[PDB]
Amino acid sequence: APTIIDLTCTVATCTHSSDFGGVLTLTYKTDKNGDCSVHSHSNVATLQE
Amino acid sequence: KEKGTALNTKAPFGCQIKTNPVRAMNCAVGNIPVSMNLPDSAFTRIVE
């Protein structure tokens, strides 16, 4: 699996609606391209994928 | 002979008088309120 260091999160827009209504952007630094498993550790927000 | 003046050359706000039917065209004053109603096909989803 690729390594990810220096990870920062920014939020572009938010709207507490029933559908998926917020956009999150991750800035990072990696050595090679691949796949990661995103997750949220609290039930306040639910990811889409 | 002695009618004196007119309105075409005296109207305020620079708006042209015409005739048949009488009207004052392009006559700048005031504000126009607009009330709209839009369908959901006009917007775009956030995702794209």
Q: How many CA atoms lie within 13 A of B6 on its CB side?
A: 7
Mapping DSSP to helix (H, G, I), strand (E, B) and coil, where does residue B12 land? helix
Q: How many helices (H) and strands (E) does chain A have?
A: 0, 2
Computed over its alpha carbons, how large is the radius of gyration of chain B? 22
Looking at chain A from residue 20 to 39, which residues have their Cβ under 8 Å from any Cβ of chain B? Answer: 20-21, 23
Tokens of A26: 């991750």
Q: How many helices (H) and strands (E) does chain B have?
A: 0, 2
Q: What experiment produced this structure?
A: cryo-EM
Alpha-carbon distance B17 to nearest alpha carbon in chain A (angstroms): 53
Q: Phi then psi for B25, rounded to 5 degrees? A: -105, 145
Resolution of the experimentally solved model in angstroms: 3.7
Q: How far apart are CA B17 and CA B11, in angstroms?
A: 8
